[PDB]
Amino acid sequence: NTKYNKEFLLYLAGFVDADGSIIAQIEPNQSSKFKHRLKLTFQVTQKTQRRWFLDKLVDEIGVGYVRDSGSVSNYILSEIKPLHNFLTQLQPFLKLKQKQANLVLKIIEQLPSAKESPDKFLEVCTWVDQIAALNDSKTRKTTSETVRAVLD
Amino acid sequence: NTKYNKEFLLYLAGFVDGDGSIIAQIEPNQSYKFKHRLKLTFKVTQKTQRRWFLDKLVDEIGVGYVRDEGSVSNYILSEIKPLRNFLTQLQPFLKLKQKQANLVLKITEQLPSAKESPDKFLEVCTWVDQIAALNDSKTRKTTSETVRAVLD
DNA sequence: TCTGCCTTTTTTGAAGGATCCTAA
């Protein structure tokens, strides 16, 4: 558990509320127990000319990585434990994405029990739905109702 | 002056570096002495469903206003004196738009003596050029060299 | 099985301007 300084988290929270994204997904997958799995991603996007800003963020957060997608680059953090540690410390300072971060934390904490009960899995999938509802969601396909249908 | 608190300025600088814009323009208009005027705008854009965020900004900055543009809204500050007071305080905390902020402050400081000679109006115009260079400029038309219709 | 990373796509929600109006 890296501890992050407060002035860093305040500025970063403003920047995340603006250019960042807290993304929760349900992905069909026949080899997982309930034929789906959850993905949680913290992302900060920026034009590739300013990839230096994202490279410095990776140094400061101490985990995650930067990838180029031609025109733009993204800082990505997905690994569950460091994602939990990071969002736990950022969320107090968030204003537009606070609810999404707290949902992600709730999901992460219930993950252990999600993976042994289909109705607990479903409940967690409804929290994913709530995240997407708070985001500017436009291309989403798999929802908790997709999961419920498939569970037979 | 209105003296802003530190935690407000940290968060806002991150938000501004993300969704904000520090804009300097040279507008052609035959009724100004030099056939142009300088226009300086601090802008924060957000989707209109989140216009309450921008309304709150008016209250916290204590000047400026919010304009609905249909799909998105903008907080706008361009009145020269409060703009100068606000950017002076925000500038230290900016990381992507710090130079643009300092150019606007520099221009503002010279405006008075700008409206009193060619050569020095043109000089200020090159400082506008430099802010546009720092921005992701894509639709700019009137530059300092356009202003060389001051040539007679 | 489970997780984290890789690749790619969609559609804006921003950014960064240009131009027009009007009082004092």
Added chain:
DNA sequence: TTAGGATCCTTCAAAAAAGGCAGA
């Protein structure tokens, strides 16, 4: 003339997903 506001336009630079591979 001037400052500040009002209307508008362009072109992305973001956001927010989708789908897939493979090592553990």
